[PDB]
């Protein structure tokens, strides 16, 4: 029985405010912190921002906090809802908002409460969070599955100087026998990579981006890939570590063509590519490097490009901007066979219930689900329990640097330990961890 | 009653393993993570590192962990000590190790249990951690004092590629009326500095160092100071934000002199300074900029340079490498009137009791105490409660970026809200927060 609902403003990993919510019941006080999403998006749930240029550069969340304290709290408390019933909880908040995009209350206000309720329910049931999550999602818990962590290690695209258009380069320690082992190997690689970067690109090159990876001035994709290969070798993990890529192609998509030199204000339209030309480029890289996952290879609305590439690509293809954790977009993607893996951002949708259904719908279609962090994260470890609870076998939660990232990885080490014999590391079979 | 003591290996903010301890009592499970120190030091407690080049680059903490699990645990559990009795707990641990620098068990194995114990005691007493810490240190609780945060924003010296010899540039929002307000102001200036840096030094300049600050290629101290002044003005916080510096002079101390171009292998010995010459340089800066605190202005053993500068300097003078949170070093510094503020790194000593005694000893001599994070931090927020419990009025815990930093800052916001009328923000009187 919830006796109180309260919110306050706290800071995310990048120094911007975000919402923190507190739910109190007879078992104690349960908290959740919302990562940073969108205030102005077409398909996503909207996060409410204060917009007062006089405070926090216009990024405050006092309005959103006020919605929780003064709008949601009274009603919720009065409603006397069973927190164990996540669905009723979420339906309640949704109805209160009454908008399709949670634009009345703000998706940041709604979500905080959604997740806190889950924490409360787990305490009530006297079980760990991931177990309660497994219950809510009807996932197999015999055994449970630990995910392969896709570690951000190097960044390109809008995150760095240099011509390199591809946004994220990650490592996936699929060859490990345990999560703890996958994490150690991953950390060794990262360290080796950091050192090589400093050596070749200069000390300043060691500074990290929002997610903990480095971002030297790289000029080509081969350059970056070679670098990573060298780090794996140096760490002595050849054959045990694969590469994941986030092309974030919507950033260089122009006039139906893809500008690989989008960084050049003077890019040559002559050289811009068509989706098929671009597809051929990726096929080439795939043939030369151990790439096992590719996210957003094509633009958000370029359905045709995605379907074409999908037909002949043999690795996991992840949809991020193409689907924006949106039910309608997911349905379209599925039907068109545009990809086979969905990057799940709880905050893009706004409630635990909807998030769960999105994953379910995805699994039902034979697709994988990569649970993901946001660039502006917090010390909240929810996602760690979520990836285990949904049994996806794969998570994207930053480099093995910056505590907003590590906090999740650490929670995973904890979970694995606790599960003992009752859990398995997804390893090479991460694409379908739910079916293991 | 403690029924179990357990340790595991987790990762610090830099991706290095560290020790995590958990203690169980009838009230629950209590945990703590140790920040990263030194496995080698002449005066600090020794952190135990595995040294196996085949794992974690030689940084594992399996041995330290085995020490907790196989040596400390059994003995601790059988001892049946009252956790409320912090002295008994620490005495027990110290004796068990039997060395003066905790080199048998490792300071990292010891500290974890010391801290965890404090958490369990707070729960038993049914009070927030900061209150228990207040009780333990005999601090004044009416009202309580929230500290001024010294936020790292820009780095030089070892941390950057320009000629700048000084290591840390921090801002301290003394002019705010509340901790929350000081934090908001602090964040605004940080954002503004980041923009300006990217603008003048290039986008790559926006990447952060270990502690969340930027590290552009700055050539002079004025250059850096003016940048900060500009950031403060851009943010509209003129007069409310002060500057704290960490010269880390030991880094450029050589042969009795101070080489300000130590980064240059071509430093001209004819330009190396004497303590008094260096003292003059600092005086000039203090004249031109609003510097209210200077850390390690002279080398760790250069007692004479320190005492002399101290005579004439009218600002807080902080001791770091000079004291290494060591009782003998502190006593010496006090006696020689070398500084008036001690940087406290709990991990440099190894136990909570000793840390408290060190602050007490410092307060007794009229000095201030700046509670500090380590470069390798964690999601553990112990230090936030500690600064409040010791009533110091000043904490050094990184830039307002990277969750291993914000976690503490966010913890303070919570403490502040909880205390309500019962607390006050140190503001301009941070030097003597204990006597406020
Ligand atoms: Cl994001
Ligand atoms: Cl340190
Ligand atoms: Mg993406
Ligand atoms: Mg220092």
**Pairwise CA distance, residues A110 & A107, whole Å:** 5
Is there a contact between B161 and A11 if contact means CB atoms under 8 Å apart? no
Distances (CA, A) of A396 to A18, B38, B433: 21, 32, 43
Helix, strand or coil for residue A280? helix
**Contact status, residue B189 vs residue B235, Cβ threshold 8 Å:** yes
Whether chain A has a CB inside 8 Å of the CB on B8: the answer is yes
Q: Please tell me which of the candidates A55, A190, A404 has its beta carbon nearest to residue B15.
A: A190
**Pairwise CA distance, residues B145 & A421, whole Å:** 48
Residue for token pair 């934090």: B183
The answer to whether residue B138 is catalytic is no
Tell me the pairing of strands A341-344 and A28-33.
Answer: unpaired
Q: Provide the b/e sequence for A81-103 (b: ≥16 CB within 10 Å).
A: bebbebeebbebbbebbeeebbe
Task: Kindly give, in sequence order, each residue whose CB lies less than 8 Å from that of residue A336, ignoring residues fewer than 6 positions away.
Answer: A303, A306, A307
Tokens found for residue B279 = 């003292």
The half-sphere exposure of B156 on its side-chain side, counting CA atoms within 13 A, is: 28
**Pairwise CA distance, residues B429 & B9, whole Å:** 40
Alpha-carbon torsion (A366, A370, A374, A380), positive or negative: positive
Q: Give me the active site residues of A, please.
A: 211, 345
Tell me the pairing of strands A368-372 and A341-344.
Answer: parallel
Tokens found for residue B382 = 């112990």
Tokens found for residue A114 = 């959604």
Neighbour tally for B198: CB within 10 Å = 16
Q: What is the DSSP string of A65-77?
A: HHIIIIIIHHHHH
**Pairwise CA distance, residues A276 & A280, whole Å:** 6
Distances (CA, A) of A405 to A36, A64, A150, A204, A395: 14, 25, 12, 22, 11
The half-sphere exposure of A44 on its side-chain side, counting CA atoms within 13 A, is: 23
**Pairwise CA distance, residues B355 & B358, whole Å:** 5
∠ CA A151-A154-A157, rounded to 5°: 120
- The alpha helices in A220-339, defined as continuous H runs, are 221-235, 275-288, 303-312, 327-335
The half-sphere exposure of A408 on its side-chain side, counting CA atoms within 13 A, is: 33
**Pairwise CA distance, residues B111 & B96, whole Å:** 13
Q: Which residues pair with A342 in a beta bridge?
A: A319, A369
Q: Is A136 exposed, middle or buried (0-12, 13-18, 19+ CB in 10 A)?
A: buried
Phi, psi of A225 (to 5 degrees): -60, -45
**A356 closest CA partner among A115, A145, A40:** A115
Breaks in chain B after residues, C-to-N cutoff 2.5 Å: none
Report whether the peptide linkage leading into residue B186 is cis, meaning its omega lies within 30 degrees of zero: no
**Contact status, residue A176 vs residue A427, Cβ threshold 8 Å:** yes
* Ordered structural domains, chain A, with CATH: 1-126 (3.30.390.10), 127-436 (3.20.20.120)
Q: Which residues pair with B394 in a beta bridge?
A: B148
Which residue from B minimizes the CA distance to A411? B10
Tell me the pairing of strands B341-344 and B316-319.
Answer: parallel
Tokens found for residue A323 = 């689907």
Whether chain B has a CB inside 8 Å of the CB on A198: the answer is no
Binding-site members of B for substrate are: 159, 168, 295, 320, 372-375, 396
How far from the centroid of its chain's Cα atoms is residue B3's Cα?
32
Structure determined via: X-ray
Q: Please tell me which of the candidates A207, A215, A403 has its beta carbon nearest to residue B378.
A: A403
Which chain A residues touch B160 with a CB distance below 8 Å? Answer: 203-204
Which residue from A minimizes the CA distance to B22? A414
**Contact status, residue B339 vs residue B333, Cβ threshold 8 Å:** yes
Alpha-carbon torsion (B81, B83, A403, B240), positive or negative: negative
∠ CA B352-B356-B362, rounded to 5°: 150
Radius of gyration, alpha carbons of chain B:
21
Distance from CA of A226 to the nearest CA of B (A): 21
Task: Kindly give, in sequence order, each residue whose CB lies less than 8 Å from that of residue B232, ignoring residues fewer than 6 positions away.
Answer: B171, B189, B192, B238, B241
Indicate the DSSP class of residue A347.
Answer: H
**PDB resolution in Å:** 1.9
- The alpha helices in B25-144, defined as continuous H runs, are 62-66, 73-79, 86-97, 107-125, 129-136
Distances (CA, A) of A296 to A220, A333, A343, B295: 18, 12, 10, 48
Q: Which residues pair with A144 in a beta bridge?
A: A423
Q: Is B238 exposed, middle or buried (0-12, 13-18, 19+ CB in 10 A)?
A: exposed
**Pairwise CA distance, residues A36 & A17, whole Å:** 9
Is there a contact between B20 and A217 if contact means CB atoms under 8 Å apart? no
**B394 closest CA partner among B326, B344, B352:** B344
**Contact status, residue A337 vs residue A400, Cβ threshold 8 Å:** no
Task: Kindly give, in sequence order, each residue whose CB lies less than 8 Å from that of residue B36, ignoring residues fewer than 6 positions away.
Answer: B12, B14, B16, B18, B47, B347, B374, B375, B376, B377
**Contact status, residue B369 vs residue B363, Cβ threshold 8 Å:** yes
Phi, psi of B193 (to 5 degrees): -70, -40
Is there a contact between B404 and A402 if contact means CB atoms under 8 Å apart? yes
**Pairwise CA distance, residues A84 & A121, whole Å:** 5
Whether chain B has a CB inside 8 Å of the CB on A407: the answer is yes
**B379 closest CA partner among B404, B355, B410, B401:** B404
CB under 5 Å of ion ligand 2: residues: B 374-375
**B194 closest CA partner among B209, B182, B183, B206:** B206
Is there a contact between B202 and A161 if contact means CB atoms under 8 Å apart? yes
Catalytic-labelled residue, pool B20, B44, B124, B211: B211
3-state helix, strand, coil in chain B (%, to 5): 45, 20, 35
Neighbour tally for B46: CB within 10 Å = 21
**B17 closest CA partner among B40, B42, B45, B47:** B47
Is there a contact between A409 and B56 if contact means CB atoms under 8 Å apart? no
Which listed ligand is nearest to A295 at the C-alpha?
3
**Pairwise CA distance, residues A265 & B349, whole Å:** 55
Indicate the DSSP class of residue B74.
Answer: H
**Pairwise CA distance, residues B116 & B119, whole Å:** 5
Q: Please tell me which of the candidates A10, A207, A402 has its beta carbon nearest to residue B13.
A: A402
Q: Please tell me which of the candidates A57, A207, A409 has its beta carbon nearest to residue B215.
A: A207
Task: Kindly give, in sequence order, each residue whose CB lies less than 8 Å from that of residue B275, ignoring residues fewer than 6 positions away.
Answer: B258, B298, B302, B304, B305, B308, B309
| 257-316 of B, contacting A, C-beta below 8 A | none
**Pairwise CA distance, residues B121 & B423, whole Å:** 23
**B292 closest CA partner among B434, B388, B427, B194:** B427
């Amino acid at each position: 029985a919830v006796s109180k609902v309260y919110a306050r403003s706290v800071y995310d990993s990048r120094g911007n405010p975000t919402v923190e919510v507190e739910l109190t019941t007879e078992k104690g006080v349960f908290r959740s912190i919302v990562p940073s999403g969108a205030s102005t998006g077409v398909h996503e749930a909207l996060e409410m921002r204060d917009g007062d240029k006089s405070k926090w550069m216009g990024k405050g969340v006092l309005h959103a906090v006020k919605n929780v304290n003064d709008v949601i709290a009274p009603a919720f408390v009065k409603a006397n809802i069973d927190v164990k019933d996540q669905k009723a909880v979420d339906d309640f908040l949704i109805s209160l908002d009454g908008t399709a995009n949670k634009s009345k209350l703000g998706a940041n206000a709604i979500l905080g409460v959604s997740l806190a309720a889950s924490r409360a329910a787990a305490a009530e049931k006297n079980v760990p969070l991931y177990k309660h999550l497994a219950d809510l999602s009807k996932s197999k818990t015999s055994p449970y599955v630990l995910p392969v962590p896709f570690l951000n290690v190097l960044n390109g695209g809008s995150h760095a100087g240099g011509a390199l258009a591809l946004q994220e380069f990650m490592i996936a320690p699929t060859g490990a026998k345990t999560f703890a082992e996958a994490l150690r190997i991953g950390s060794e690689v990262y360290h080796n990579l950091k050192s090589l970067t400093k050596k070749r690109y200069g000390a300043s090159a060691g500074n990290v981006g929002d997610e903990g990876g480095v971002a030297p001035n790289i000029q080509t994709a081969e350059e970056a890939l070679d670098l990573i290969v060298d780090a794996i070798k140096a760490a002595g993990h050849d054959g045990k570590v694969k590469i994941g890529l986030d092309c974030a192609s919507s950033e260089f998509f122009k006039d139906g063509k893809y500008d690989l030199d989008f960084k050049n204000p003077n890019s040559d339209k002559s050289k811009w590519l068509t989706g098929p030309q671009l597809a051929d480029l990726y096929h080439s890289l795939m043939k030369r490097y151990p790439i096992v996952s590719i996210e957003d290879p094509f633009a958000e609305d370029d359905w045709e490009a995605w379907s074409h590439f999908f037909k002949t690509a043999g690795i996991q293809i992840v949809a991020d901007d193409l689907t924006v954790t949106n039910p309608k977009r997911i349905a379209t993607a599925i039907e068109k066979k545009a990809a086979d893996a969905l990057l799940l951002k709880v905050n893009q949708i706004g409630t635990l219930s909807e998030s769960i259904k999105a994953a379910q719908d995805s699994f039902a279609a034979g697709w994988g689900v990569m649970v993901s962090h946001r660039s502006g994260e917090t010390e909240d470890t929810f996602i760690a329990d979520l990836v285990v609870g949904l049994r996806t076998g794969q998570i994207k939660t930053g480099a093995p640097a910056r505590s907003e990232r590590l906090a999740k990885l650490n929670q995973l080490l904890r979970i694995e330990e606790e599960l003992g014999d009752n859990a398995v590391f997804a390893g090479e079979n991460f694409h379908h961890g739910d079916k293991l």
